[PDB]
Amino acid sequence: VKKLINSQISLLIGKGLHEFDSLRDPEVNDFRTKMRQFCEEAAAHRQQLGWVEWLQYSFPLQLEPNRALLVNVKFEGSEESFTFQVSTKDMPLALMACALRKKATVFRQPLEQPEEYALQVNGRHEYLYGNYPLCHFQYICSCLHSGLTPHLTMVHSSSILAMRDEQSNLWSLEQPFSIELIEGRKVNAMKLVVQAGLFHGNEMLCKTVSSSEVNVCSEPVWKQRLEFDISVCDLPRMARLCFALYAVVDCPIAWANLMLFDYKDQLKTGERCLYMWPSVELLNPAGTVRGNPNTESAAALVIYLPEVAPVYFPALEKILELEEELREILERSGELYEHEKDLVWKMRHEVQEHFPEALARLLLVTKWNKHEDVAQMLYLLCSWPELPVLSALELLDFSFPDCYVGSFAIKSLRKLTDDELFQYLLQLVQVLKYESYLDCELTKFLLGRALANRKIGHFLFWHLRSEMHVPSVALRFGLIMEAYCRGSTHHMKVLMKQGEALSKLKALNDFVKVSSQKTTKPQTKEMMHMCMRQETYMEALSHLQSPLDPSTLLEEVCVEQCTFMDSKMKPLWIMYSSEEAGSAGNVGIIFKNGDDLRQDMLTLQMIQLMDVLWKQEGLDLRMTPYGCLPTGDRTGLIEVVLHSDTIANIQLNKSNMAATAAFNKDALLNWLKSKNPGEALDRAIEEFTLSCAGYCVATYVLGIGDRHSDNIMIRESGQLFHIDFGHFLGNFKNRERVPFILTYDFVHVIQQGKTNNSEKFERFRGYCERAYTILRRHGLLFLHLFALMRAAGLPELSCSKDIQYLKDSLALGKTEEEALKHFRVKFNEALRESW
Ligand SMILES: Cc1ccccc1-n1c(Cn2nc(-c3cc(O)cc(F)c3)c3c(N)ncnc32)nc2cccc(C)c2c1=O
């Protein structure tokens, strides 16, 4: 069985486990056994969970960030159902009580405590339970706003337990730090030079030192000493030595980093061969500290670390052993002059005692190239009060490379709710890329959270799996996924089923791409359907959890409704239906291969976050933050928003249609009227107005560009939403400041088809202003999350200029009054542009 599980982990993660063995690497070996133990202990805990706790693990609640309500309720093993009038303020227990009383009357009564049950949403992996009014559950809210009757199933605790059960598994060294540069074996045109620097995060620990110049041969020889302007004793624990090999008459060729201490805190010595990474400001301190795995091809640098005595970084116990104030004035950009730094440092105890949230500022002023100073910082850090989540998120930035700081940040982040963790998971995964060692507090934190919440576990898996084609992270991410699989054998098989479906979709899309070059769309479509109706495809593509949202069940693939877009990357449109789910089982996924989906997903997650922040302040802008999930090399899934069309399509203004128009400016309003006749129209126009305000503000703040009428859609409900986000932060395809945008046809709908309607139009302006002012108040959250996202290496999120864009859009250097005046100037400028 162990062999079997080993082969399925290998297949699931995209890497053979024998490849870990072949490295014969103690660090890999230690990571694997330790994390295996950790994860297996998590599994043992899970299998003995109480039944309600099991539900919290496998089906965590979906909550929103008096009134009449009809609900249909049936019991697990029956077609017989009951429709009940309850209240939106009623709790699940009261509803379950009604169900059990009816069951007792219809089926003659003994009878049975509602406390023995939970309510499943029919045909979904989603459950309603807990002391929450029905209107606090997203599902109930969904139905209320869309009009539908909630359909729920009474599921007994013994049924839940069966699910659980079926799913079981030294200061002494004063001399200058020096190295010997020996030789290389590379390819260029000039002479060669090696630049080397010592870094602690972004900060240089002393000036960089450079090689002598040597002719551009294939196997250069230097045999030279590089001495650095720092004492061996002052090397901080997380010191990085960074190399750049380049040609000079400058032509960059390669780079390589390593830690000066190994994973066991031993100071490194003596000889190393550094397999370099090809060069895409020469030195790359944020780059990985592990060598390039393509040793057959990679340029290589051979160096010598001198045996300076075995020496280890001192233990914490040893480390610990070792007037009326402008303080407050400067202490709220955050960049300071040298004298200001001295004051903060001098006043470090006062920072700790009275301004614990200014830790980052203090950290940025400590001299990391002086061991006494670091000791003095660590001493205060070991007694530092826990910080808020927001503050901890900042402390994960590559600017804070020290391991004790890293560990402090994680400690402060443990109070993250699962909902918050889910909101920030993308960024936390990216931060793994900054880690210096395999076994680290971030990795253990994420694994523990993932093992305790199957939804976290699902998205953690896919975030790691989607990057296995990236050599720099393949090893780390492969190891994390293996350990995770050790912690849930059952979830591994659920994930394999998703991977099988994705393998078939890739093969299907490759066929579609070939066929559509040779024949008409109707013909390729019929060929697609014949391919899908093969038993191997019908089986692989049916009965899985959606990778986009594991609570959505993709049951029967609906072949006749599947198609493809006959342009660009030819993405597939795949429809599903589910008898048990009814209408809500009719769902679609888009499979696209050829584009990197990371930027689309990041934009959508930021829009989701805006929607949550707005809703927390009682503002619902009726947004459509649909799912988007990278799954592989320029491959992933996008959630289909049904009953929606593009503005472009509507504006075609085809004849013989319900929307056909005397003036093109009436096409959209006509379309809305056709979908929302009579009294329904007023609601739809309001839905349009709200969502238009949300998207106007979202795209302005994020600097979203390349917006045509084919990348804005509208739902039949009236909700406008943007799709397919290729460009943001003013980087348009170079760097411009994107203005606020008001489109005339949209203003026309908001004004209910009237030329002048200041009453409706100024309401819309008020929504935009409210939305903008709310985001400003959380400005730091967006700044911190985008800073962490720099780890992803998106070309439109690369540097400080990109993050400056958000500082300017949110006008965070301004007062709230000043920011609004400025926003109004932009809104007004945007208004006159409107024809
Ligand atoms: C549904 C529709 C109406 C008008 C014009 C285009 C489309 N449409 C669209 C428009 N579109 N694009 C997206 C979309 C969004 C993304 O962020 C990324 C992406 F690649 C696609 C989308 C979505 N999520 N939900 C609903 N419609 C969406 N996408 C398709 C993708 C694959 C295959 C097909 C046949 C389509 C497709 O027909």
167-177 burial: b if 16+ Cβ within 10 Å, else e: beeeeebeeeb
**Considering Cα of 518, then 520, then 523, then 525, what sign does the dihedral take?**
positive
Measured from the Cβ of residue 7, the count of other Cβ atoms closer than 10 Å reads 11
**∠ CA 656-662-668, rounded to 5°:** 75
Neighbour tally for 186: CB within 10 Å? 20
Query: Quick count: other Cβ atoms within 10 Å of Cβ 630?
Result: 22
Q: How far apart are CA 567 and CA 609, in angstroms?
A: 32
Mutating to test ligand 1, I would choose from 713, 715, 717, 728 the residue with most ligand atoms within 8 A of its C-beta, which is 713
**In the block, residue with structure tokens 């986009």:** 548
Q: What angle do the packed helices 471-487 and 441-452 form, to 10 degrees?
A: 40
Asked if 768 and 776 touch (Cβ cutoff 8 Å), the reply is no
Label residue 227 exposed, middle or buried (CB < 10 Å: 0-12, 13-18, 19+): exposed
Q: Give me the residue label for tokens 């020469």.
A: 282
Q: What are phi and psi of 132, to 5 degrees?
A: -140, 135
Contact status, residue 697 vs residue 768, Cβ threshold 8 Å: yes
The DSSP code for 369 is T
- Residues 145 and 718: their CA atoms lie apart, in Å, by 12
User: How many A from CA of 672 to the centre of ligand 1?
Assistant: 20
**646: CA distance to ligand 1 center in Å?**
9
Q: Which residue type, as a one-letter code, is found at position 444?
A: K
Q: Give, as one character, the DSSP assignment of residue 137.
A: B
Q: Which residues lie closer than 8 Å to 766 by C-beta, 6 or more apart? A: none
d(CA 745, CA 750) in angstroms, rounded, equals 9
State whether 376 and 398 are in the same domain.
yes
User: Contact at 8 Å (CB) between 628 and 670?
Assistant: no
Whether the CB-CB separation of 301 and 245 falls below 8 Å is answered with yes
Q: Report the atom number in ligand 1 closest to the C-alpha of 597.
A: 18
Count the helices and strands in the chain (H runs, E runs).
31, 27
Angle at 405 between CA 399 and CA 407, to 5 degrees: 125
Distant-in-sequence, close-in-space partners of 308: CB < 8 Å, separation ≥ 6: 173, 175, 232, 267, 269
d(CA 217, CA 610): 55
Ligand 1 atom at minimum distance from 639 CA: 24
Q: How far apart are CA 63 and CA 139, in angstroms?
A: 8
Rounded Cα gap, residues 433 and 413, in angstroms: 18
Number of neighbours of residue 228 by Cβ within 10 angstroms = 20
DSSP state at residue 249: -
Q: How far is Cα 454 from Cα 487, in angstroms, rounded to an integer?
A: 11
DSSP string, 425-439: HHHHHHHGGG-SSSS
Q: Are residues 507 and 615 in the same domain?
A: yes
Whether residues 627 and 673 fall in one domain: no
Query: Is the shortest distance between the CB of 216 and ligand 1 below 6 Å?
Result: no
Question: Ligand 1 centroid vs 655 CA: distance in angstroms?
Answer: 23
Tell me how far the alpha carbon of residue 640 lies from the centroid of ligand 1, in angstroms: 7
Half-sphere exposure of 736 (CA within 13 A, CB side): 11
Q: How far apart are alpha carbons 787 and 799 in whole angstroms? A: 9
Name beta bridge partners: 592: 636
- Cα-to-centroid distance, 833 and ligand 1 (Å): 29
DSSP character string of 696-756 = HHHHHHHT-----TTSEEEETTS-EEE------TTB---B--PPP---HHHHHHHTTT-S-
Identify the residue whose C-alpha is closest to ligand 1 atom 2.
645
CB 485 within 8 A of CB 13: yes
Closest C-alpha to 625, from 544, 695, 686, 575: 695
Ligand 1 close to Cβ of residue 589 (< 6 A): no
Q: Are 76 and 68 in contact (CB under 8 A)?
A: no
Count of all residues that appear for the chain in the document: 835
Nearest to 456 by CA among 402, 420, 430, 506: 420
Widest Cα–Cα separation across the chain: 96
Decide: 712 in ligand 1 pocket, CB within 6 A.
Answer: no
Q: Which helix (H) or strand (E) holds 639?
A: strand 635-639
Same-domain pairing of 408 and 466: yes
Q: Which residue has the tokens 């009682």?
A: 618
Task: Give the CATH number, domain containing residue 596.
Answer: 3.30.1010.10
CB of 142 closer than 8 Å to CB of 152: no
Question: Distance between CA atoms of 378 and 611, rounded to whole angstroms?
Answer: 39
- Show Cβ contacts of residue 332 under 8 Å, excluding neighbours closer than 6 positions: none
- Last residue within a domain, chosen from 114, 143, 169: 169
**β-pair type (68-75, 151-156):** parallel
Q: For residue 336, how many other CB atoms are within 10 A of its CB?
A: 16
Say if ligand 1 is within 6 A of residue 647 CB.
Answer: no
CATH number at residue 260: 2.60.40.150
Q: What's the number of domains the chain is made of?
A: 5
569 Cβ inside 6 Å of ligand 1:
no
CA pair distance 792, 812, nearest whole angstrom: 25
Ligand 1 close to Cβ of residue 640 (< 6 A): yes
Q: How far apart are CA 237 and CA 234, in angstroms?
A: 9
SS3 86: strand
Distance CA 827, CA 829 (A): 6
At which of 610, 640, 670 does a domain end?
640
Residues 547, 637 contacting (CB under 8 angstroms):
yes
Is any ligand 1 atom within 6 A of the Cβ of residue 723?
A: yes
- Strand pairing report for 270-275 and 300-305: antiparallel
Q: How far is the CA of 645 from the centre of ligand 1 (A)?
A: 9
Report the amino acid identity of residue 199: F
Handedness of CA 272, 275, 281, 286 (dihedral sign): negative
- Amino acid of residue 473: V
253 in Cβ contact with 237 (< 8 Å) = no
Q: Cis before residue 729, ω within 30 degrees of 0?
A: no
Q: Are strands 549-554 and 176-184 parallel, antiparallel or unpaired?
A: unpaired
Both 288 and 235 in one domain: the answer is yes
Answer for the pair 313, 322: CB distance below 8 angstroms, yes or no: no
Q: Is the CB of 379 under 6 A from ligand 1?
A: no
**SS3 assignment, position 100:** helix
Residue identified by tokens 């830790």 is 359
710 Cα to the center of ligand 1, angstroms: 9
Q: Quick check: 468 and 478 in contact, CB under 8 A?
A: yes
659 is written with which tokens?
A: 């929307």
571 CB within 6 A, ligand 1: yes
Q: Which residues pair with 71 in a beta bridge?
A: 84
Is the peptide bond preceding residue 270 cis, with omega within 30 degrees of 0? yes
Say how many C-beta atoms besides its own lie within 10 A of residue 395's C-beta: 20
Within 8 A by CB and 6+ apart from 512, the residues are: 524, 528, 564, 570, 572
How far, in Å, is the centroid of ligand 1 from the Cα of 642?
10
Q: Whose CA is nearest to atom 20 of ligand 1?
A: 724
Q: Calculate how far, in angstroms, residue 626's C-alpha sits from the geometric centre of ligand 1.
A: 12
For atom 16 of ligand 1, the residue with the nearest CA is 724
* Neighbouring-strand partners of residue 714: 645, 720
Residues 328 and 476 in one domain: yes
Distance 232 CA to ligand 1 centre (A): 59
Cα 490–Cα 496–Cα 501 angle in degrees, nearest 5: 140
Q: How far apart are CA 504 and CA 11, in angstroms?
A: 15
Is residue 401 within 8 A of residue 201, CB to CB? The reply is yes
Give the pairing type, strands 720-722 and 712-715: antiparallel
**Same domain (yes/no): 86, 161:** yes
Nearest-CA residue for ligand 1 atom 19 is 724
Q: Are 269 and 307 in contact (CB under 8 A)?
A: yes
Q: Say yes or no: 505 and 621 in one domain.
A: yes
225's enclosing H/E stretch is strand 221-231
Place of tokens 């496998």: 58
Asked if residue 801 and residue 683 are part of one domain, the reply reads: yes
Quick one: 480 exposed, middle or buried, by C-beta within 10 A (0-12, 13-18, 19+)? buried
Tell which one of 707, 723, 725 to mutate to probe ligand 1, the residue whose CB is within 8 A of the most ligand atoms: 723
C-alpha separations of 531 from 81, 537, 593, 697 in Å: 39, 7, 18, 44
Query: What amino acid is encoded at 708 in this protein?
Result: H
Identify which of 130, 131, 133, 155 has the alpha carbon closest to the alpha carbon of residue 144.
133
- One-letter amino acid of 417: T
Cα(85) to ligand 1 centroid in Å equals 38
In angstroms, the CA 744 to CA 669 distance is 12
For residue 155, the SS3 value is strand
DSSP symbol at 276: P
Query: Quick one: which of 819, 786, 821, 788 has its CA closest to 804?
Result: 786
Residue minimizing CA distance to atom 38 of ligand 1: 565
Q: Are 715 and 644 in contact (CB under 8 A)?
A: yes
**Distance (Å) from CA 736 to ligand 1 centroid:** 28
The helix, strand and coil proportions of the chain, stated in percent and rounded to the nearest 5, come to 45, 20, 35
Measured between alpha carbons, how far is residue 649 from residues 572, 654, 671, 709, 713 in Å? Answer: 19, 9, 11, 8, 9
Q: Is the CB of 577 under 6 A from ligand 1?
A: no
Question: Which residues contact residue 132 at a Cβ distance below 8 angstroms, ignoring those fewer than 6 apart?
Answer: 61, 63, 91, 92
DSSP letter at 831? H
Contact 89, 133 (CB under 8 A): yes
Q: What is the CA radius of gyration of the chain?
A: 30
* Domain of residue 695, residue span: 643-835
Probe target for ligand 1 pocket from 558, 638, 649, with the most ligand atoms within 8 Å of CB? 638
Cβ of 461 less than 6 Å from ligand 1: no
Q: 182 and 115, same structural domain?
A: no
Which residues on adjacent β-strands are paired with residue 210?
Answer: 195
CA–CA separation, 206 vs 211, rounded Å? 16
Label residues 23-44 b or e (16+ Cβ within 10 Å = b): eeeeebeebbeebeebbeebbe
The response to whether residue 716 sits with its C-beta less than 6 Å from ligand 1 reads no
Q: CB within 8 A of 753, min separation 6: which ones?
A: 666, 669
Look up the CATH number of the domain holding residue 91. 3.10.20.90
Q: Tokens 């998590």 identify what position?
A: 42
Query: Quick one: CA torsion of 372, 377, 379, 383, rounded to 10 degrees?
Result: 180
Measured distance CA(18)–CA(6) in Å, rounded:
9
d(CA 640, CA 248): 52
For residue 573 and ligand 1, the question of a CB distance below 6 A is answered with yes
Label residue 832 exposed, middle or buried (CB < 10 Å: 0-12, 13-18, 19+). Answer: exposed
Nearest to residue 700, comparing CAs of 692, 711, 709, 708?
692
Query: Structure tokens of 453?
Result: 């919440």
Which among 643, 655, 651 is positioned nearest to 714, based on CA atoms? 643
Question: How far apart (Å, rounded) are the C-alpha atoms in residues 201 and 360?
Answer: 14
Minimal-distance CA residue to ligand 1 atom 9: 565
CA-CA-CA-CA torsion sign (402, 403, 409, 412) = negative
Atom 24, ligand 1: residue with shortest CA distance: 640
C-alpha distances out from residue 33 to 41, 464, 479, 486, 629, Å: 12, 20, 11, 11, 31
Calpha distance 802→772 (Å, rounded): 20
The two tokens of residue 22 are 């072949």
Q: Is the CB of 563 under 6 A from ligand 1?
A: yes
User: What's the 701 CA to ligand 1 centre distance in angstroms?
Assistant: 24
**Cα 284 to Cα 263: distance, rounded to the nearest angstrom:** 21
DSSP β-bridge partners for residue 721: 713
Hey, whose CA ends up nearest to atom 23 of ligand 1?
Answer: 640
Phi, psi of 388 (to 5 degrees): -65, 160
24: left (phi over 0), alpha (psi -120 to 50) or beta: left
Take atom 3 of ligand 1 and give the residue whose Cα is closest.
645
Q: How many Å apart are CA 445 and CA 442, to the nearest integer?
A: 5
Contact present, 686 and 699 (Cβ < 8 Å)? no
Environment class of 106 (CB within 10 Å of its CB; exposed 0-12, middle 13-18, buried 19+): exposed
* Integer Cα distance of 203 and 367 in angstroms: 10
Ligand 1 atom closest to Cα of 595? 20
Best of 512, 590, 715 for a ligand 1 pocket test (most atoms within 8 Å of beta carbon): 590
Ligand 1 touching residue 715 (CB < 6 A) = no
Whether 630 is in the pocket of ligand 1, judged by its Cβ within 6 Å, is no
The DSSP-derived string for 432-465 is: GGG-SSSS-HHHHHHHHHHHH-HHHHHHHHHHHH
- Closest residue by Cα to atom 8, ligand 1, is 565
Ligand 1 in reach of 687 Cβ (< 6 A): no
What technique determined this structure? Answer: X-ray
Cβ(649) – ligand 1 distance below 6 Å: yes
Cα–Cα distance measured from residue 508 to residue 532, given in angstroms and rounded to the nearest whole number: 8
Joined tokens for residue 92: 């699940």
* Cα–Cα distance, 427 to 602 (Å, whole number): 9
> Alpha-carbon distance 358 to 329, whole Å?
13
- The residue out of 282, 314, 346 marking a domain boundary is 314
Would you state the structure tokens that stand for residue 479, as one six-digit string?
A: 């190891």
Stated resolution in angstroms:
2.0
Tokens of 801: 């200029």
Q: How far is the CA of 132 from the centre of ligand 1 (A)?
A: 36
| 763 in the same domain as 674 | yes
From the CB of 709, is ligand 1 less than 6 Å away?
no
* CATH number of the domain bearing residue 19: 1.25.40.70
Q: Of the candidates 270, 272, 247, 271, which has an alpha carbon nearest to the alpha carbon of residue 186?
A: 247
Does 631 lie in the same domain as 673?
Answer: no
CA of 806 to the centre of ligand 1 (A): 28
